[model samples]
Target: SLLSADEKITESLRSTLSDVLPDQLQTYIRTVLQFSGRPEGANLLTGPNTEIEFFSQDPNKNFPNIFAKYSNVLTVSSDPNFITSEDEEVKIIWGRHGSDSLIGFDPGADLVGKRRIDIFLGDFIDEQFNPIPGALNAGKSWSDRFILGDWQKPYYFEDDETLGLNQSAMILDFNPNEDVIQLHGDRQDYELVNISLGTAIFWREKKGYDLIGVLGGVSDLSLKGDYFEFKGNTAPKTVLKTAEHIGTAANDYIFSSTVDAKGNFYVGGGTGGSLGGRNIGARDAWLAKYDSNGNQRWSRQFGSTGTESLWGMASDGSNIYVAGNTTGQLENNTVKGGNDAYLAKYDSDGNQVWIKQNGTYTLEESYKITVDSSGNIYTAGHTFGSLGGPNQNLEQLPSTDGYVAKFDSNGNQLWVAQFGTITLDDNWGVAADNNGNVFAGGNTKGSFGAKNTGTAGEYDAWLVKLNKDGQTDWVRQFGTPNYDFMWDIETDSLGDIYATGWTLGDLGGKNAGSYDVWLAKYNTNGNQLWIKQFGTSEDDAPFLDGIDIDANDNIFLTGNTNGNLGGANAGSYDAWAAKFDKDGNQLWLKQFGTPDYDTATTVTAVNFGKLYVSGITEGSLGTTNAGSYDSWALKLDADNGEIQDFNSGFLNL
Candidate 1:
């Protein structure tokens, strides 16, 4: 919701509801979810440890005892007790399950009336952390003779480790069934692992000198009780999966992974002069799917001559929609001026259905793509120059603006809307509601809207809503008087939009922080509801990389933290994730790193109640790092934000 200069911030859900229903200005509330010790009886209500107890309050709400414990756990659950005495069937000390103590209530419990468990906090579970057990010879580094001065820019280091920095990313998974997590990292020669005390699948691609895809194995950590495990894991399992290319180098920026509705997993990468050599489609995008057992299901590659790259991907029940930048035109050798936003759809059997390129005069890259229930593809990204294609219903602003295009199941452009300012603006995320109203998020640089749009900061984060007709209904610019960017956005069933990103200044309109992980909740109408900032001074950088709302409307976000402002400063930069109630109250906050510099880039929530985040780390996976960088990932137990200790290991790179 757009606001005036005198507007104040409100942190109450009741106030938020009143404002939204009455079409009031957005009232943002910020409540910090701090991780406190376990809860005993409410002091108001007590019971034996062996028997579960439920208060008289509604079980649909957060329990007073538990909620007060993780006082830092933010949520809008008016009643904090999710567990009811009637729902407790068998109990051996209420919070413990399968020899593991639980940290959070599982919204999935609505299915089985069981408490949900998440991985523990701060475990360098992937190879992106420092390597353990094995260390290469001191002199062993990047070999200068192998440096191809042309195709691949090799800035050879007297230290070979720095040579691979540009081409590495972290990947991991969380298994909510057994309350276990598996974080893994893949780099040229370095690998890492960390697991929880249960059955889990671990993958690593190790063959020749080049380490690539995920090899498979089920990790079983020595089971223990509810106490948090705080040690490095060192174990080994054989490779379960491998791609055809191993020795050939690939650009690390072109990494993607997705899970189908059937629990199948797929990985994709680009190949070209710098990618694995392939002319199938100039700069072809390659993908391989694997069954639950790590066995290959199918493999396919696509692209056209003009340089193409595959970035964001999503799959509906029957079709896979891929978004990226494409340059090649299918019919002729005549090339388009600059890169265009590209979208492609494929059948379950790996057949190309249709592909379209959206670009003109300037560079346009689609960073994120999503599909609604009706199979309408929604793509978001920034565009300079002009909007691609001349669709009557699609409106292009006079200057460079964020472009959101909708397409039918057959790949026909339904309607396109130009967003952002005449200046620099880019939309990085898109999500849809049941009504087909699309919500888009990114950052903007200049004045927008017919009335009051802010133009004070260098780049202010933005969220825009458009009706099905492709006309802008509302636009909200978030952030302070500094540079800011919005990385992702999501909408719950009710159309309440949630967005997370980072801010560089105190431009909260009124209530602002130094630098924070900026999170905003808006009603479907695009009103400013509430905004929260999580950060501190010392460059305590925070970015909301991922967000999700549970069945009860609890908002959870994942990102990286560099300071101790709102929570603990785990290290130089730690893998961070937080949960907030509907009212903007913080539920709990947790940070993970290997005592060294670490950064988290992406977060994805899994079924059974867990969140998987991917990013890079310089420290060891399990071992503490004094210096040096490596790829890292953490599979956080979703609810409790704990680290799964068993499958997690510190790879000694």
Candidate 2:
């Protein structure tokens, strides 16, 4: 089409980008046209991927003599599509063979199917194969390892130049029902008896949990081709490898472990000691989640700004909830002011959802949290505030009251209920009945609250209930005056509530123990159905932290204890586990740990009566003594009551 002179003159557009280009690229076209009649084509400025044509001032300048410098211009051009298309084409060049060395390629084919394993062997012994107490020895175990069954290949350790550990054999398999990766170890000719072992975690392949807890620590990873590559412990670029070194130090143990519905794994961190050696002001509540190939998806930090700490966690479908205390405001927010109960929520990606602070004059803390069917949340703790104050919003109950608050899924404040004596009272955890009713258990120091409906003791182990609105409906105090503390509560499928803690009092409907792990059951109506106490007079009594009820109404609990009472296992203090049937009949009890300090804080149920327990392990993990205080989780075969068998491979796998 021929352009009209008026239209062509009106629509002549100047280059949209004028400032960024070089001076010659933006030269006036009039200057280039002045010498266009020469035989040789006039050199005009242009650029790649651009077209240029000269314009003339003369009226009838042949119109076509304007040199077309389509290929011979030095003009500046920037068509975003040009760069994008080039990038797509060049991507395939690097992933091919000989990609790195341009001239030729090293096959490196054997490395294609390889995986990594880590082991911490103890100090050396003289001539013979004698036992070394603390460090890794010839035959340590990996019974504490957890597996994710999504991988097609078996990852084990081979001790050549690339791998170590001379006397070990390893095999890994998948469990269909449990959805886990299972490992087996066989030490041929070497007696692997009673070797102190550590913990292991199996992160599902690229399904999105990128880190698997291994050899007592966490391994950061990246996946290339068919295998996941491990990153080691330098400055931590992408977190390739993690060690099983257990201690209170942030660098030592992966304090807590969680996995999302997508099979992504989260490693929670706790602290050891701070710069002051006080171990108080310095500790962290760190959290990191991984993708399916054991690669880190995201990481976040949480905790009190002062001497606060985080101990337990609970999760709904889309967010995570935590329970612990802080003496100051949390790093993220300073909501309620001073040393109050700390409760914070985070989304699936580890973003803060909301933080709630509940306290009064003195200190308070939330030891644990439990979520209900409708996604409503429940928290229980001891506070030094009053339930009834002059100001409704500032109206705190004017005493050291035990409190429980309920929140809807959106983190909105529903209602806060305070119940306690005029003096000291401590509530550890809260549990919900199948109905909407809530229950809280702990020990109270005095007898000054609503009228009690049942028989009471000195400093009673108290159990109280409330309606859905946080209004107290019934309260019961049971225990001896010396000293007692309630730690956890659970409700059976039948709606019966079970409370567990420690009592320095007595039982038999009478009294018992200098300190005993106690169990008291109540029907949905808050009626005491049964009570049982287990322990000895010595300081060896058990301290129950958490509880669970299985399908058969069998109860399980985890905590710490001292002395020879309740099968103390001859340690300074051992983290203990116990089971009981529906009738409160004591079942088999097992003591797991080395001769140091171990305390179990939380317990969750697995399929078909199996249970997963996590806590802190100090000194030696049942004798292996990986480091100081390692986080530990033990998976037990509930049916037969035996630790699952694993062969020699998992220690380094």
Candidate 3:
């Protein structure tokens, strides 16, 4: 043994890490500390499997050093591998567990063979068996409670000391597929009702259904373990496959989708339950993120006491912009008019950076939002009154006007172009090219841009080009003699504008059926390039913001139809995704659906050879139905429309 030279962390590998560092750095620190003979041992007692979530970044405020100052861990990270491993029976701790215990040691895994696990619904009740003021909410983890595999036992509030100083049962953590709920006799004994904040378990004890505990965002879950089963749901950690089924028994919707430069996808909409975050009240406009591998990184469910919805989403490489209409104050942002158009920025980690909202007295709603190359934001929607602009016959009937506004990256408004035909003009989609050109499109019952080209009952699809300074360069309005409307709009690399929607009459070609899908392209000078209209024997439409163009000029559109567009319809309403060349040639079409209604609301082709579509499904598409309107996402190969991946547990995560 000769003298050995020492090595050090000479060149600091310190880069601002958003994640993937916490995993390695923690492992490194544990290794060095253990090798120095400081902490004592190596094994983490394993019982049942579980994936526990930690929100705070500070270890002191989170995991703490109990395992640090104690164990001499060699493979502490793999002792049980609650996360990266698979288990038939798993207990998941989403946030902090308010109890002061860990699992495994309590139940002793297969050594005991006891298949029961306990979720502590503390007995923090009063004389009337009602929740006391300081009662604990089980949905939120306040203590550190863990269960050992099969050896774990149950603790309930049936008898004497069971009426201790614990708390009422907030039944959010109960998985109806497994486990038991005691004390509350029978399933129908108590009813699960929807409240402004979330679902509350209403016991029949009090006259007006005793408000015993809350299931805060149990929209996709129901009771079965000795209780009534109204619905069912569960969320698995580190999702296994590409395709997924997501929902609670409650209603859910996803209106828009976008991907970051790194290929992480995001979907936004409103949910009835707490898909991931806590649902305070009303519908929380939730945003969920997933990697290119279909693995979910995180999800955020947020809302106020009033109503909120996120219909438009866009990402400027790093930060994301989400916009829509809100009736109530969101995240402390004051409401301006009866309804306010709110725009917010969130980092890639799903953390809200800031929120900006604007509105006039009557009503205003921002339907879709986009960001340009300079990170400038644009949102277009309809307004009943002036929002920093003029609205002729502001208080008159049928005075609805479409407005477009521009904002800087800091959530600062630049200008508002609120104009209408004094009839009904809507701006459903907005697109910004690399240049200063911004395009917005919808349809109008009244004359817009051009003269009233058709007779009554005709909706003329129109698009307006706006400069970076918010000035209208030109507006193009054209339509068939029947019903025509644009649901989506986009721009190609050559600044060619594309609009997609449905038509009842002959707009492009002869109407194929009930409502035919139509696509129109125009040059920057407002000259029509070409138009194509085609569909099935039934209604076919790009329901919402349903078209996206990739970097390579590949166009992808998705929607719902009554008849088959590609293959035979699986059932009632089928969802379809089709591809088109930049020159307006239909490349291929693929139609698939469940036995029930399925509508593909929005789509994005951000990544090369990758096209993602989001929609609402009544029947099982990716996985089992969580309940009512479960949202689904499909990753298809941009080349041939072949299904590549899928995700559904948006809220379940």
Candidate 4:
């Protein structure tokens, strides 16, 4: 008698089959029946040589009368985890069963069609389907150039069997009894079924389900897990986002940028040719102001007949202070010699408030500038021989001395104090505290302010803390056995100092690699708190271009890295930004650029969540390229240095 009803009948048939049929065939039939009633049945088909994994459908949710319409067919999904309305179409793939089509026969009819069903042909042990040795590649050795086929197209069974579908089905020629139903190709047609538009589906190859036309509109194709799914519309934008490139065909680089209280962004740098449709001069100083929405408010270029460059800039809410050097004239004020330290003030409306020049018959250049709360502007630079005039001339100073000069709100020189030995000295970073304390740091050749710790190295890093009255409070120097350079300095809310530079050798015996980026922290007393060095195995020069602190005391630094640094290099000299906590623990390092020279000259923290970096690029950034070397700026998430937006706010740099 046939077993069709309950477990008792099935047990009776199993006993009779054991006595009648061969042991191998009886075991295979029994295992098949056991699998049809359990969820773990799908796991039984996986093997070393098989590329498919089976997924059984919910019996009540199954289409085409479940057991009546299909038999021994499995379904596979493109994405296993899918949310209907929230997801889009993932990978579009296909599948096919059997190593070849020379196996099972299919009746030529409208319900079944002419095709071959794949049978195991091997016995099942412990209700698990195991692939026979030599049945396929026993060892599927993986390689780099392995052709996995196009996951977005039909399964490539003709090329490599291992490159085919992740799921498939096996069909049997006969059923044990009428109670066991067989899978039909007509019922497996996924297109005819009324599946939801955004719903997911797993199509089995031998089950004959066509999932191509079933999905709706195709927007972004990807995968969720193992099931194939589709996605709908995207969410609307809430916050403002932008990027831009600003300059002429000639080289234009932005060295500094600031965001005001109203979200307006102010930038300072230099330009070679015409800016904003007007010719300023040769290598002229350029400044631009933008509204919160990235709309250009005004742009101004300051120069006359020679080369001029703006290296530093600071804002006092209603006005801006720019520091640079000029070899020509500004309005009617001519530079003294080869190059003179130039400082200019501008109102919020881009009108030039005042311009000041200080130099002897020699070389002078201002590298950094800042503004205090009392509207006092201070600039730091270096002089070649003797500087003439008031605050320009120094008594018995060295050939090259680092100088700091203070100017009131109007343009009157308050006090100028020069500090350095008779050797080479240059100041590039300046910061002012709330209590009118000014801090400046740079590279110094010898002892500064008669304070020699006796532990100085070659080209030691120099830092000076001056009181509100321009009197020296303390002096400190730091370095290693090799060349040391200071690029920028910043002070936290509690009067602590932070400086950035590069060291050729170990800084306090903590070097990570060659030409490593160095960062040192100091208390208000000029005593060393801690120093940290970071970089890859190659030349990672921080150049100390930028140093800023966020609301949580986390420091952000940016410069240029010659090779790979914590990530794959985009190309030669890629721009890099890094974040560190208050205790000097590195939080993240981000490298970005095209296949050329990209350098980050400055970095700023707009808030705890927003970070800004500006510099120059010889190649493309994102999609904006001004045909040659252009100014580039990037907005990022402050916590992780991940880019948020870029190049949407500047036309050049």
Candidate 5:
């Protein structure tokens, strides 16, 4: 042949390969070319490429034990990820950015891309991704590791450190593999442990619990925003806890009561029969002392052969002052004419100290009595004849004029002052402020005292303030175009006055029905502040029998109502109690009674939440019954008109 063209081309390609690459690299390149079957006529010098290392002669077999020892112990590269050790700490390697995947010499032996596998092992897992009970599913990230799956599946944590999964930073979700995945963490990495799953709540080591011997439990737990709430024991929601009836077999009625500083109750009233086996007189005035348990400690009756009653009573820590009218000789003091005003003092042991009868020779009756800070007694009522008899220049009014008389602690007459019109006038309620200033309230027919405020009704409610020297300070009168009766008056700690009674018509534009309960408040200067009238649609003959003030200046009014005054009536006449704030705003009203005639004559309250109500009842109360008209004394919760104690007997009366 003239020339070998293939041989020339092959020689050119081999020359280019040897000149461009190293000997080992060139040999490796030529071996790859040889495997591709692109040899020049297959006549090139046949030689083995010694640069290639064959660990195993057969492609399907691995190297022997000697080669395996050298392979694992040898350091493949300087990089930490290239380590070759007996124990494989990591199967897949991640790049610094966590996006790169693992790779190997075999293309199939790799994770390929940014894929993640999450393992979840728990008591409950929701497959619908909804937040169900015991499953964390709502408002969670879908990119979270653990997801929704079969719920209520049986699973267990291999490591105790996974017990705090409830409070862990990781979130759960719904996924198909949720039930198949197994969660694993190193013991040296996680700090949480001993987590009770669905069995009990996990409380912190230092956080405390309310129950005894229970380190952790869940009850009434609520979650708001990022915080949790745990509710404990609360007070009872009942407003009324006690309902009792106190009375006697014989006819009796309680007119007044006093709650001393030590919370003792002293009640004064009239009894038909003898009290405590003491046959003093007919219609005797009785005084009984009751301990806080509503037990009658001692009872004493005082009267003569005639009718006698205690209308008002006051206490000065140790002594009890009672004022009433008697028509018989009392303690050797003979009755003058009709009925003489009687004032008596008794110790706490129910022993009468001194009894005095002071009045005109005609008809005189004391309706109310009060004791000042100096132990001076003030009584207010009406007198028929000349008040200061035998040319005494104190009072010379002709008809029955309202008179206020003061006496020393030893029953010595201090001074008597009379103020009223030329017609009939009665002073029923009397109270003393902190400065010894006296305030008396009643009903007057003509002009009130000296000042003639145009009369608005037949009998107008009148209030008079008198100084300590028995001189009239000011007088205030109020009523509608009908008969008005004032029964009780009280003063607060700030000297503000409150008067309560019954009005026949509209009282200062506050009346409601035919006969309404009237309540008015006045300042110390006798200026009217606010007035309130309360009644129902029917003929409500509501009478304010008693008025009291608490430490917070709240007013308490108690009496009897014949019509529906708010709640349904339990009888013909029911006892009513109402409270008002300092500004005359009504707080609450409560009415309760038996199915017969009942009345609350006097009400008193203590500073520590107790209301003492006294009256008379003719029917059974709740279930207990005392014959005829029985004197009723009820202890109630001040916050609500809930009866606390009830007693019925002649001694209890």
Candidate 6:
């Protein structure tokens, strides 16, 4: 009876046949199933709204007749009439279900007859533009070529409304119920947007990431149809990269971070839920300390009854200073109306020394803060009213002015300077040199430093040299016709300054993408030295105060990108940390991300040890998500960004 059961199969079904079978891959299946396959019919299909149609499937073998039919749809194309040439052999679709041989593939002979759909994701050529390069006549039909995995090249997609040649990614004869949509991403990586040209499948959004494939006439019915079923989402890497989650679920973010001498890391951000202590307001400015291994140590939160956030942080070995914006009073200080800028001092033991709040009822917020070796504090931000003595704008027609202020270690205000252009301007970042001097940067619309090259909605970035008395010595400004903004300012031990930010146009090198990350260097006299711009072919920018200088005078910048900055795109927006020497030469770059949204907000490096990057992610980095959004951090090799075992050897303060 078993011998008779084996006889029911064709010559291709026998295991002995493929041991030296014709055109089969070297490896043969050890065991072949005894039963034959059943036949699921075919249809000569055109796109959901196209004129040309072809029989992409076998008609002679089609028994059950799975005809192409339109259900609910905004637009529909009629199925094509079947036709074939007499000179050709029976149509055998090669690479059917991504296979090399047809063997005994008959749905009519098998118990269940379903297979994965073939997807051709590109434009060009007449043979439906598949992956096979040289020829298809050996044993392949027109349908065997363009399965994304088989093609290994960056392709260009063309969309033409006039020629009616619109193809992002193409899939032939898809069965939603029985077959799967073969893809290499999770359900969250894709979204089916209902369009007039059928359901346009896109990964993330259509901007940076192009569409997956458009199901010509497929419309989502009230009851069913899900493309997620076909997604062959790749699992998370079995090995390990580096990063961590810190803040609670509620919209957590990292605006500033620092590394201490004891191999400890400090990160500050806004969290609505309890990240360290109990929830205090709509959002609390939270700061937490982490050991070298990224284990959370002591954490502290500051807030009032209204909105609050930490935008800038700096450590001077003796203590830490953080500055941000607040709408309500802290420590019973009466609200200064509008938005108020506040600075707080905390000892190394997480104990608060004092808090200072200042404003003029218009608006004030410190977007960046820094500490000099002498323990003096400097703050940079924008103000609607005057946080400094008076508005620098001579016309004084009520402009949003750039502000820079200084304070002693005891939280005592020493001096303040405010400057602005003819229109709105912003004081973005601040840093201090060893010579009791300060470097502050801002974006202006007026020609304060030099002739403003900005036009329309553009702004020019200017860095000013301020003496110890908060006296402006010189100002250097540069920009193109596109918008430019500085996000961080830092000074090396030699009194050299580095300004980091993003520019829409070419400020230094050629523009790499929509938004390019740029770093500029200046001399002590505020003379422009050089500018360096680098980015991918997608959006890239550094977070607020996202640049830092290590003890070796190397520049480290942390940011977010959706392009192949470090490598191929890793799902959605990813976190990236890059190292550059003092001369603006790139040392190394590391990009890491999960399947969801990720960003590297700030980076810090101790003496000659590990580099720590802090940020926020909607998905897990090394662990599960805490809630809606979570705070994340990473510690890597200072030289190579590789994950290294924790070592306290760098703890020599």
Winner by lDDT: 3
Candidate 1 lowest-lDDT run of ten: 24-33
- The candidate, 1 or 5, that scores higher on lDDT is 5
Q: Model 3 — which ten-residue stretch has the worst lDDT?
A: 1-10
In order of appearance, the predictions have TM-scores of 0.54, 0.54, 0.63, 0.59, 0.59, 0.63
What ranges in model 3 sit over 4 Å off?
1-242, 647-653
- Candidate 1 global CA lDDT score: 0.46
Q: What do the candidate models score in CA lDDT, each in turn?
A: 0.46, 0.45, 0.60, 0.55, 0.55, 0.59
User: lDDT tens digits, residues 239-274, model 2?
Assistant: 101212233332223333444455444445454333
Candidate 3 local lDDT, 361-460, one digit each (tens): 5556677998898999999898766674777544324246788899999987888887658777878779998889788888776778787655442468
In model 6, which runs have C-alpha deviations exceeding 4 angstroms? Answer: 1-241, 392-398, 645-653
Error of 5 at 279 (Å): 3.4
Better of 1 and 5 by TM-score: 5
Q: Rank the candidates by lDDT, best first.
A: 3, 6, 4, 5, 1, 2
Instruction: Let me know the TM-score candidate 2 reaches against the reference structure.
Output: 0.54
Give the 10-residue window scoring lowest on summed lDDT in candidate 2.
Answer: 78-87
Candidate 2 or 5, higher lDDT? 5
lDDT of 1 by residue, 517-542 (tens): 67788898767788887665544343
Distance from true location, Cα of 344 in model 4, Å: 1.0
Per model, state how many residue pairs clash: 81, 58, 27, 37, 7, 22
User: How far out, in Å, is residue 73 in model 4?
Assistant: 77
Question: RMSD in angstroms, candidate 1?
Answer: 25.2
lDDT of 5: 0.55
Q: Candidate 2: where is the Cα deviation over 4 Å?
A: 1-269, 273-281, 287-300, 348-351, 387-399, 448-458, 509-513, 540-544, 564-568, 607-609, 622-628, 645-653
Can you give the lDDT of residue 5 in candidate 6? 19
